[PDB]
Design a binder for this molecule. Structure first.
Ligand SMILES: Cc1[nH]nc2c1[C@](c1cc(F)cc(N3CCC(CC(=O)O)CC3)c1)(C(C)C)C(C#N)=C(N)O2
Ligand SMILES: Cc1[nH]nc2c1[C@](c1cc(F)cc(N3CCC(CC(=O)O)CC3)c1)(C(C)C)C(C#N)=C(N)O2
Ligand SMILES: Cc1ncc(COP(=O)(O)O)c(CNCC(=O)O)c1O
Ligand SMILES: Cc1ncc(COP(=O)(O)O)c(CNCC(=O)O)c1O
Ligand SMILES: [Cl-]
Lengths: 442, 442
């Protein structure tokens, strides 16, 4: 007593939007530092009937039976996760149930500190995530600033983590968790110096490595597993999996952490796991461990180095004057254009990128940069020689954005009136589509 | 730079567990009250490349561009939802971003009362959900009992909601939220008497209709939209959608609630929405508002009545002596078996059901019942005449379980040892597989 007509037939309205959405992905230069493109195999998992099963709890400790094949999938995922990230299953534990990155973080934090607990993280404006304790004078924007007591540390004037400030803050504030690993930080992290600061106050070291996960896995960047009590990561950015998250915990350093974290995920915060996710995550973690994927990840860094370098060659400034990873933050103060303006301009030419704060910005209103990254385009097969084109496109967009502002005024509502019909944008948008359309596409 | 081989070639290991899992579903009499089977079109959406898009915020108020086609899909989903639940978009709002029922609930509760806020819900043992404030003497098990101050109301010795006790508690405790709508409650809810109790003390009325959503949509059971400030629901149970959730809020009773719910979902709790989910939810929501789906939901109720009736005909006792909805709770105390033992026995015969407390049970340790429901089997095409067979099978399983207990003892360790190889179970298991195996499978 069900309708099994295909999606196109059942709901032609929804299907057109989706076939359009797909075309737009295929014809966009996607420089979102947090985005990627999943392969068919990962998408086959997400469409799998395993999502029908209710499997509350953990394997061999479930509330219901019927979970024999669900148990194998969940154990396979945790196993493959520990292997991919170079950790001993005797020393490290992994929970594969969090629905997404923010959930993963709020859960792991609650586990470690509980309600009212003291946490420290990087300010949003300096490259931290919302779930690292973000609040504002007006309101406690994140649950992590409300269900926890949070203090926030900034980067210095040059866009670097200021460890002297982290210590100064940690000694006066005396928290139970110090968060590191960030959303738009273009350099590697000194976990060693974090681990030393946490020891000095007796706080846990929490590394959120969502943006750099593949680099940690593949040993291209520093390893937070040598120093952290907990490591969280999303599976959908550079790692190239489905939308899900993983919480890692150091059993050896902290006996009794395993139960705290598992009980935080369930039944404190979640109900039933999403097994289609878990399956999809397993599929990708097998690909993550191949040397073929390390090839891909090295290329993300190569493309990102070239991009930074080609952008500097065109007198465009980058925060910290370069990058150690997949992402670049472009400082736009020399052109007198805000980030939103250049985002609008780039959207108008099928260039996907986001506005982003820089060190100088007081508030998060009117950010003076944009953030770009290479995972997506590197997945689409772009190489080091292709970054000059991207850099050229961004230079032309910056110029155009400057032209339009002088004509139409500073106000965004005024600025955008200049956008539709612009012959140079139509020309440029056209140039983008011809190049992007051609690239391979999973 | 990716591998695009099909799931069977890329990962033969995972694919075999999934093909096996598919067999177990096809060959099980699934009476899990909270489970269903999605059609192909909904699974096409879950496997769609729309999951690649990062679209933080809400439509027309995104943090990035590139979200034209995502905005349409999210607007279509909210619209289709307000329609299905027969509410005017002028009077009601819906948020379509929650990743699951549990998340949705914790978000909505936070919106209304904030940290430390006072809530009231049904006890877990009496049929409430974990997210209705469940705690226990040893520990605050749910976050909803920890980040909030909760008090829990029982059902009476016959299994019914005891409104005098709710009033008795509401007047002394003075909460700001009273939760109604449950996980294992076989009868309809007196939403008006709840509204009467909340006005008397000035608390919000929260109805979690996850288990009974299809009935509310189809105007087969009482409509909590007439009385509630907030209505939450999952999309994956009787409604037959993907694993997602919906939060509804009544703007007219509470102007300025819209911003509270929307800001609680993001950025207080979640980050990026899962657009494949939203799409899926939209696809099913079109089906929910059809005469064909009303036919299905009535059939869920017809089956559940016949099942209750065939079980009583075999001298098996039901909590509240019957049902108004899709679910039955069997009281097993006359046979002197626990629910965990009958779950094990039914697992051995490919019968999916869960153990469940009854009013008499003091703790959640050793629940004396099992919970069954008809959505899954009604989806598989079973009619009212087929419930006698299911009743035959459950009566045969209860008999077998009492025999085994006599032979091997009351300890669960010992009980299971009698289960592998049992000639009658192999026999019964085989009769289940032949009947269930045949039925249509989406
Ligand atoms: C959306 C997102 N999620 N995690 C983030 C962001 C960023 C962002 C970028 C932007 F331009 C603005 C905001 N916000 C401005 C203040 C808002 C307060 C309110 O909701 O009322 C919260 C969101 C946030 C960015 C990557 C996209 C970002 C920055 N930089 C960092 N570091 O991490
Ligand atoms: C698994 C599930 N999720 N939401 C639920 C349940 C139920 C259940 C059934 C059972 F047999 C046991 C427990 N628990 C026993 C106590 C546990 C506390 C701890 O973690 O130590 C929490 C889970 C819970 C049931 C539907 C499956 C149920 C009951 N009845 C209700 N009302 O709602
Ligand atoms: C460091 C970090 N942690 C957690 C998350 C949360 O992931 P979910 O969206 O799955 O909740 C993000 C998302 N990153 C925001 C961005 O770069 O666009 C992140 O950058
Ligand atoms: C009333 C109610 N509310 C919320 C939820 C949470 O759903 P998620 O698992 O999607 O978080 C459930 C789960 N019901 C469990 C069961 O009936 O088997 C529920 O019964
Ligand atoms: Cl999903």
């Amino acid at each position: 007593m069900f309708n099994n007509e295909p999606l196109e037939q059942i709901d032609k309205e929804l299907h057109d939007i989706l076939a359009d959405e797909e075309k737009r992905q295929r014809e966009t230069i996607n420089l979102i530092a947090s985005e990627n493109l999943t392969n068919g195999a990962v998408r086959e998992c997400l469409g799998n009937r395993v999502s029908n099963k209710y499997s509350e709890g953990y394997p061999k400790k479930r509330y219901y039976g019927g979970n024999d094949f669900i148990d194998k999938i969940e154990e396979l995922c945790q196993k493959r996760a520990l292997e991919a990230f170079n950790v001993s299953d005797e020393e490290w534990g992994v929970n594969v149930q969090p629905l997404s990155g923010s959930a993963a973080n709020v859960q792991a934090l609650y586990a470690l500190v509980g309600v009212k607990g003291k946490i420290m993280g990087m300010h949003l404006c300096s490259g931290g995530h919302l779930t690292h304790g973000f609040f504002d004078e007006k309101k406690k924007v994140s649950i992590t600033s409300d269900m926890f007591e949070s203090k926030l540390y900034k980067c210095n004037s040059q866009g670097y983590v200021d460890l002297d400030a982290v210590r100064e803050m940690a000694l006066s504030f005396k928290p139970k968790v110090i968060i590191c690993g960030y959303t738009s930080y273009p350099r590697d992290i000194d976990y060693q110096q974090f681990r030393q600061i946490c020891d000095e106050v007796n706080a846990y070291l929490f590394a959120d490595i969502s943006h750099i996960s593949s680099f940690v896995a593949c040993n291209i960047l520093n390893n937070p597993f040598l120093h952290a009590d907990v490591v969280t990561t999303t599976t959908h950015k550079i790692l190239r999996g489905p939308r899900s998250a993983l919480i890692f915990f150091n059993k050896k350093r902290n006996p009794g952490i395993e139960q705290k974290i598992n009980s935080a995920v369930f039944p404190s915060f979640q109900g039933g796991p999403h097994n289609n996710k878990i399956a999809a995550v397993a599929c990708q973690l097998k690909e993550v461990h191949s040397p073929a994927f390390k090839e891909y990840t090295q290329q993300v860094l190569l493309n990102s180095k070239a991009l930074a370098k080609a952008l500097i060659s065109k007198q465009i400034d980058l925060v910290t004057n370069g990058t150690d990873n997949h992402l670049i933050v472009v400082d736009l103060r020399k052109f007198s254009i805000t980030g939103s303006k250049l985002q609008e301009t780039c959207n108008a030419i099928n260039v996907s990128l986001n506005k982003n704060t820089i060190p100088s910005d007081v508030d998060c209103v009117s950010p003076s940069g944009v953030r770009i990254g290479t995972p997506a385009m590197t997945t689409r097969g772009a190489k080091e020689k292709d970054m000059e084109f991207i850099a050229d496109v961004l230079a032309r967009a910056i110029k155009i954005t400057v032209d339009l502002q002088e004509q139409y005024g500073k106000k965004l509502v005024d600025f955008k009136k200049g956008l539709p019909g612009n012959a140079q944008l139509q020309q440029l948008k056209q140039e983008v589509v011809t190049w992007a359309g051609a690239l391979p596409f999973p």
